[PDB]
Structure 1
Amino acid sequence: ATFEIVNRCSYTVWAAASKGDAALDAGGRQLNSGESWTINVEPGTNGGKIWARTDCYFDDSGSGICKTGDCGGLLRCKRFGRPPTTLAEFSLNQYGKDYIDISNIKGFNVPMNFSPTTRGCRGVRCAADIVGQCPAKLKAPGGGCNDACTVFQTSEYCCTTGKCGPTEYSRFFKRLCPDAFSYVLDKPTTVTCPGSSNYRVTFCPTA
């Protein structure tokens, strides 16, 4: 499957793509404002994620640091990034279908549209100004808006026991982005697409 990753933000973003234990394609790349990066994801990939990192500094070997979404200091991510990270999530060719979603469960750093470029399903979007409106306790110094589990590490926010309800914090994310998961037991906003579809992730889709 092919993913075109487009940076429409006015600032440079460092895109990342990983399935948790391995990079997808090159795993990461600098995208200046307007740049597009096309990657190939192997069919059958379960649990892949794409996200943006902000305010990164890397050296030659591709080592450094980002203020949001750092994946252990690497340009080419092998693991997932450090919150806050708006997340595009996908599992491909699962019994003939593809499943996509956008998640705020790990917080929010960059607005994002996640849409197919082929037929038979809708896209999803979280493009509200969550950082600007972020409740005081969730604001991350490096930028972005943390989820409540990252900040407070309680069983309720993290849904450790498998039973948990919405919270004042999760409702904040849900109210600004109804099409994104706001906590782990949220009513699913997953979109079902035909198997072997192709997609575009756009950072800052409106502004």
Structure 2
Amino acid sequence: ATFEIVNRCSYTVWAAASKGDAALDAGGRQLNSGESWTINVEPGTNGGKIWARTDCYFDDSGSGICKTGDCGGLLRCKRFGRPPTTLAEFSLNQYGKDYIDISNIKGFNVPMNFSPTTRGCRGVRCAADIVGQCPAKLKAPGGGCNDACTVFQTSEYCCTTGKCGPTEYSRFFKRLCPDAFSYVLDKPTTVTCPGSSNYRVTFCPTA
């Protein structure tokens, strides 16, 4: 499966791609404003995620730090990134179908469109100005808008017991981006695509 990752933001992002215990493709790369990076993701990849990282520095060896989405200080991510990170999430070739979503469960940093480039399903988008409108208590000083679980570490926000409801904080994310997951037990906004579809993740899809 191919994912074209496109940075339409006016600022540089460092794209990242991981399934939590391994990189997808090279795992990460710099994308200046306007750049595209096409990656190959192995069929059957379950629980894959793509995200943007902002304000990164890396040495010649690919070690450093990012202000949002840092993955253990690596340019080439092997693990998931530090919140806040808008997430493009996907599981591929699951009994003949692909499943895609956008999630704000680990906060929001950069707006995103996540769309198939092949036939048979729709895309999803979270392009509202979540950082600008972020509730005071969720604003990350390093940049971005944290989820409430990251900030407050309660069973209700983290849905630790498997029982949780929507919250004032989850409703904020849901208000701004109805088509993205706002908390663990949100009514799903997962799209079912044909098995072996291809995709494009666009950062800052709209002005």
| TMscore range, shorter length | over 0.9
CA distance in 1, matches of 2:42, 2:109: 27
What SS does structure 2 have at the residue aligned with 1:50? strand
RMSD: 0.3
Cα offsets for 1:105-157 (capped at 9, x unmatched) = 00000000000000000000000000000000000011100000000000000
Residues 1:6 and 2:13 aligned together: no
Cα offsets for 1:71-115 (capped at 9, x unmatched) = 000000000000000000000000000000000000000000000
CA distance in 1, matches of 2:113, 2:101: 10
What SS does structure 1 have at the residue aligned with 2:131? helix
CA distance in 2, matches of 1:108, 1:144: 6
Q: Offset of 1:162 from its aligned partner?
A: 0.3
What SS does structure 2 have at the residue aligned with 1:28? strand
Q: Offset of 1:180 from its aligned partner?
A: 0.1
What SS does structure 1 have at the residue aligned with 2:67? strand
Q: Structure 1: any 5+ residue segments left out of the alignment?
A: none
Cα offsets for 1:165-199 (capped at 9, x unmatched) = 00000000000000000000000000000000000
Instruction: Name the % identity.
Output: 100
Q: Offset of 1:50 from its aligned partner?
A: 0.1
What SS does structure 2 have at the residue aligned with 1:145? coil
What SS does structure 2 have at the residue aligned with 1:68? coil
What SS does structure 2 have at the residue aligned with 1:193? strand
CA distance in 2, matches of 1:4, 1:141: 31
Residue number in structure 2 paired with 1:126: 126
Where has structure 1 moved over 2 Å in runs of 4 or more?
Answer: none
Normalised TM-score (structure 1): 1.00
The number of residue pairs the alignment matches comes to 207
Cα offsets for 1:1-37 (capped at 9, x unmatched) = 0000000000000000000000000000000000000
Normalised TM-score (structure 2): 1.00
Residue number in structure 2 paired with 1:168: 168
CA distance in 2, matches of 1:48, 1:154: 26
